[PDB]
Design a binder for these strands. Structure first.
Lengths: 63, 77, 143, 196, 67, 221, 219
RNA sequence: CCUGCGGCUUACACGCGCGCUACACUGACGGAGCCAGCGAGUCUAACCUUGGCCGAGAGGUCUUGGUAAUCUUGUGAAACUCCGUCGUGCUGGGGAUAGAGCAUUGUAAUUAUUGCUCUUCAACGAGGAAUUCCUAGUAAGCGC
């Protein structure tokens, strides 16, 4: 189960959810075509790197 | 090495060093044990598996005759 | 190029000066060391209570080489600490006065202690020579 | 002295392990782990806690050095932590003489729980939602888990803190889950994938 | 006693078989129930004669001697 | 030989299980000096004035379950701890080191001392058996556990087969509530399964003894 | 009467506050500091740890602050208070006695922290005027026409007592609910020098071993 | 164990809260090294002091320094650092608990006023429901 890598393009805004977790748009570092919003919990920023354990999972508005 | 044995009607172990095995009795504390080990001319770091009954009866008599061997009146319980 | 006790280490030169005093042999230590703990805030007696007075005298000689003069109050507060008074708050206490006065008399026997200006403690030519000899012996401790 | 001339050319870590040739194995930790700083001791107490990303400015080794004095019995003791860190580094360089830095970096890279999980209140219905973990967040979590396992080791054991720390670092470098931090990372991944 | 090396001769044989090889540290020299009736943690004290197995690790002290 | 070790939340990865009791009448009702319990047939003014019912309030269900559970052969083999969720929400963890008396007067006195204390002590003064974990049972329990409600309405099966099918690292848990009029829903949200053992309605003591007999022949306990 | 401590700034600028404590507060004293923070508008606070007071106050002064309150205690509960008005203003040093705690009693709603309504009751002497002006210039300038947060100072028997009450204009009269703490506040000195001086012009000290101060208010 | 609001009593079985000490090897005791600031202090009185002295210590000896950066005072502080001793032992962690002796007043300590010393060595194996405060020289810990 090789978890891919993803570089965050930008932190997705207005993602109404529980305070502490945010949706952020990241394009995969394996290939710059796979891009999706993902739910990041830790203190993050833009243009960073992260490990994505799912391939085509995309975040949504979590109320 | 020696295990517990009858000393002043107590059972005292010898595998531990000479200060604390000489402390578990009523009327003797840390400082009293240390100074009687000083006054009985025994090495302070020995455990009492050694120190055969010569020195054991010597510390018996230094208990029952302490002021003979410079145990001061300000040290008394 | 200049040999100083200040160049020499704490534990190393302390053991060296204590052994040199043991090599000197004559210091007239008090008989209370068989029963004393060298402080009122102390709980157990000193482990090497025979060389505890020697270590204290070596530290006093090091201070007398460093500072101009000291006193029994200064020595006692210098060699003083807190106390196991129980559970109440422990302040810092001084060291034993009679042990300090005897040690002050004990170092003038070897000539290490002399009456400083306006009284106090100082070193003499014999004390400075012995300190220099012990330091040079400890200057060759690098092997 | 002689070691003064030796360190005059190469600034090794305390002149006992080389502070060069350190490598970071796992990805997504570049610019999240500070390994590019040539220094002497991990006690550079300059103001770095003020900002968020300036905490990544201090080394992860200095972060673990701060993690040593994390207890009521030791909060605020510096030189105890420094001497314990030197002893633990010597224990690492004895168990694995490659580099204390390289072995510690390998353990940090192999002790990372790649996934996170959150409990969403849901208006009164908490649910387990798998979420990502940030790079400095994952690094801090691994360092904290390691320091916590090391501290929990020395509860009833005459082993030194440096010894238990080196044993946990070896378990993490092997990834054998013989340490609390590696077991915590495995259980965290298992829980995150349990409710993915 | 009855030999003054009681639990410190066969244990010494096991130590010479094992501890002179890997080696352990001053904390791991407490293995095989190194306890009272001899030297529990004083294996480093007697390690002046034996050398060349592994560097030591001193907790209360701070030393690493190749023994 | 020796007895098996302490079977509690500390014994987590080892062979252990939990017996869970709930929906009993266990509180502290001080009669106006000391602390007393809610008795139906004893106090007539107090029970009617409290707001409870004679058929509903049952304080001896826990005592009967403890009498039928603490003497189990599996309990002497070191495989079960006791978890109790009281009517006031109190969660109590009991190791099998001792055995409470079956005398409801003495058991009620010990329970009232626990209610006024939350603290029990040993004769040897070394092992306070009455531990209170962070409530409920599943907040500090073993890391591998099996949760199931043993209902008289759930699927009735033999206790030997289901227990023998379980792994030795998991902790089978059973929830029992001896309501004279009630339902098998006291710890429904905590149970991860719904299984049955008997074809007739039984109290907590009888169902607990049936589960203990099944566990005794499961792994020869 | 507006004073030289306030004439250039009384209704001109609305003030901000800073709440802090003497040295190593007890937890309940910190909680009471939290209450006096949340009662005041423009409320920001900062814990004092190992701080030299000339350095602390001087650093707080260039950053811009109108007033500074700092507390004391006696084994858990507070006893004393002082106010330091920053632009060379007068420090006032009080003894506070009784308290009710919003944590303690009930959650009775909310301290809405709106620009509150101000009440100063039964002040006659020029010292009463000094207390009224100094304390009035700590509240926000500009509550609304119907600001329902009535703060209340009462000056009966030299023990000024403060409460907070929240009112609704019900059918035949207002109706009030009790919030905030309730106090027995009493001053004992006024110094026009700010507390950094330690030696400047003391306006006022309470005579204590004067006989007639059994009876007389205001010295 | 001291202590702030609540029961009952005198010419003691209690309900709400604040703190300190510990529940041991980053530990505990033996010796070595050591970095402060705040101020305070005595004329017709004896303060704050330096030393030498002796007494384990507790405590007593005369004197200058200081009416004040001068003498305390560099308050040589404590945690801190090194090695030594010790092995997790409810031991040497721990001293609540008593008794005795010693100084030491004071008219008397008698109701352990205080201080030393010896002896006595409880609970405490990390504390549930809850629970407050907190975003850097900060929480936290140490002393004058």
């Amino acid at each position: 189960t090789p978890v891919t890598l993803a570089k965050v393009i930008k932190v997705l805004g207005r993602t109404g959810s529980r305070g502490g977790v945010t949706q952020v748009r990241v394009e995969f570092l394996e290939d710059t075509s796979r891009t999706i919003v993902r739910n990041v919990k830790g203190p993050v920023r833009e243009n960073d790197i992260l490990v994505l354990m799912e391939s085509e999972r995309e975040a949504r508005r979590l109320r | 090495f020696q295990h517990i044995l009858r000393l002043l009607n107590t059972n005292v172990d010898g595998n531990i060093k000479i200060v604390y095995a000489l402390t578990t009795i009523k009327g003797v504390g840390r400082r009293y044990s240390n100074l009687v080990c000083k006054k009985a001319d025994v090495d302070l770091h020995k455990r009492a598996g050694e120190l055969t009954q010569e020195e054991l009866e010597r510390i018996v008599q230094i208990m029952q005759n302490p002021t003979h061997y410079k145990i001061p009146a300000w040290f008394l319980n | 190029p200049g040999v100083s006790v200040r160049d020499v280490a704490a534990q190393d030169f302390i053991n060296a000066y204590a052994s040199f005093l043991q090599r000197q042999g004559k210091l007239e230590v008090p008989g209370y060391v068989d029963i004393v703990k060298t402080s009122s805030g102390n709980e157990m007696p000193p482990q090497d209570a025979e060389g505890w007075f020697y270590k204290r005298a070596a530290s006093v000689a090091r201070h007398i080489y460093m500072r101009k003069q000291v006193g029994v109050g200064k020595l006692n507060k210098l060699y003083g600490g807190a106390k196991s008074r129980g559970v109440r708050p422990y302040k810092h206490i001084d060291a034993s006065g009679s042990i300090n006065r005897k040690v002050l008399q004990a170092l003038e026997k070897i000539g290490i202690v002399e009456i400083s200006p306006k009284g106090g403690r100082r070193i003499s030519e014999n004390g400075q020579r012995d300190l220099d000899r012990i330091a040079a012996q400890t200057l060759e401790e690098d092997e | 002295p002689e070691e003064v001339q030796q360190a005059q050319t190469e600034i090794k870590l305390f002149n006992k392990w080389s502070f060069e040739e350190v490598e970071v194995k796992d990805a997504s930790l570049v610019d999240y782990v500070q390994v590019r700083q040539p220094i002497f001791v991990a006690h550079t107490a300059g103001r770095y806690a003020n900002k968020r990303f300036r905490k990544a400015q201090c080394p992860i080794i200095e972060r673990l050095t701060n993690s040593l004095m994390m207890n009521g019995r030791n909060n605020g003791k510096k030189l105890k932590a420094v001497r314990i860190i030197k002893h633990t580094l010597d224990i690492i360089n004895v168990l694995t003489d490659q580099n204390p830095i390289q072995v510690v970096v390998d353990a940090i890279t192999n002790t990372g729980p790649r996934e996170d999980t959150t409990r969403v209140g849901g208006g009164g219905a908490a649910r387990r939602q798998a979420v990502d973990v940030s790079p400095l967040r994952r690094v801090n979590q691994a360092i904290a888990l390691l320091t916590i396992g090391a501290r929990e080791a020395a509860f009833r054991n005459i082993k030194t803190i440096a010894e238990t720390l080196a044993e946990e670092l070896i378990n993490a470098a092997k990834g054998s889950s013989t340490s609390y931090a590696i077991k915590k990372k495995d259980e965290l991944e298992r829980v995150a994938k349990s409710n993915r | 006693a009855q030999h003054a090396v009681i639990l410190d001769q066969e244990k010494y044989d096991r130590i010479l078989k094992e501890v002179p090889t890997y080696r352990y540290v001053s904390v791991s020299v407490l293995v095989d129930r190194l306890k009272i009736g001899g030297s529990l943690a004083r294996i480093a004290l007697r390690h002046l004669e034996k050398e060349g197995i592994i560097k030591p690790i001193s907790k209360h002290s701070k030393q690493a001697i190749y023994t | 030989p020796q007895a098996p070790p302490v079977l509690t939340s500390k014994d987590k990865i080892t062979k252990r299980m939990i017996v869970v009791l709930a929906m009993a009448s266990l509180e502290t009702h001080k009669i106006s000096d000391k602390y007393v319990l809610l008795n139906c047939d004893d106090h007539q003014g107090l029970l009617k004035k409290m707001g409870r019912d004679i058929s509903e309030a049952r304080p001896d269900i826990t005592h009967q379950c403890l009498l039928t559970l603490l003497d189990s052969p599996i309990n002497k083999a070191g495989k079960l701890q006791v978890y109790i969720q009281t009517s006031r929400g109190i969660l109590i963890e009991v190791n099998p080191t001792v055995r409470i008396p079956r005398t409801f007067k003495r058991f009620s006195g010990l329970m009232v001392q626990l209610l006024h204390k939350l603290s029990i002590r040993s004769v040897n003064s070394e092992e306070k058996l009455l531990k209170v974990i962070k409530n409920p049972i599943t907040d500090h329990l073993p890391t591998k556990c099996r949760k199931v409600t043993l209902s008289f309405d759930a699927p009735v099966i033999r206790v030997q087969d289901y227990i023998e099918k379980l792994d030795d690292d998991e902790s089978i848990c059973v929830f029992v509530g001896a309501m004279a009029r009630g339902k098998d829903n006291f710890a429904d949200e905590y149970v991860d399964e719904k299984v049955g053992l008997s074809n007739y309605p039984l109290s907590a003591s009888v169902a607990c003894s049936k589960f203990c007999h099944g566990a005794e022949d499961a792994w020869n306990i | 009467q507006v004073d030289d401590e306030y004439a250039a700034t009384s209704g001109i600028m609305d003030p901000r506050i800073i709440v802090t404590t003497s040295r190593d507060p007890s937890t309940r004293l910190s909680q009471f500091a939290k209450e006096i923070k949340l009662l005041f508008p423009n409320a920001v606070r900062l814990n004092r740890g190992n701080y030299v007071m000339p350095n602390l106050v001087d650093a707080c002064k260039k950053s811009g602050t109108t007033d500074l309150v700092v507390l004391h205690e006696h084994r858990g509960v507070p006893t004393s208070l002082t106010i330091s008005h920053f632009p060379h203003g007068p420090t006032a040093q009080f003894s506070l006695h009784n308290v009710v705690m919003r944590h303690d009693i009930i959650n009775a709603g909310n301290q809405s922290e709106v620009n509150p309504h101000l009440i100063f009751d039964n002040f006659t002497t020029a010292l009463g005027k000094r207390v009224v002006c100094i304390l009035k210039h700590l509240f926000n300038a500009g509550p609304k026409k119907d600001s329902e947060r009535v703060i209340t100072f009462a000056n009966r028997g030299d023990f000024i007592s403060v409460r907070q009450h929240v009112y609704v204009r019900t059918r035949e009269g207002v109706e009030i609910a009790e919030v905030g703490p309730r106090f027995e506040m009493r001053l004992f000195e006024l110094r026009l020098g700010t507390l950094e001086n330690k030696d400047a012009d003391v306006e006022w000290q309470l005579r204590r071993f004067i006989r007639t101060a059994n009876k007389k208010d205001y010295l």
